[PDB]
Amino acid sequence: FKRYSGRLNFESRINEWLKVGANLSGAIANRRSADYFGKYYMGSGTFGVL
């Protein structure tokens, strides 16, 4: 799992009548999953170490 993140929360009072705000974020992420755990194959997982 590997991610590069960013965040900008911003709040402001424009005048005595209106208050605006914007909280915005972004990310670039890389996932990968071990999709053999939960099944009984011959040499994989903790079933394979046992």
Binding site: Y36, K39, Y40, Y41, M42, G43, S44
Partner: peptide, 13 residues
Amino acid sequence: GGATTATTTTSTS
């Protein structure tokens, strides 16, 4: 893997 061994029970919850 290969040659899946059998007699497992299904998992609900």
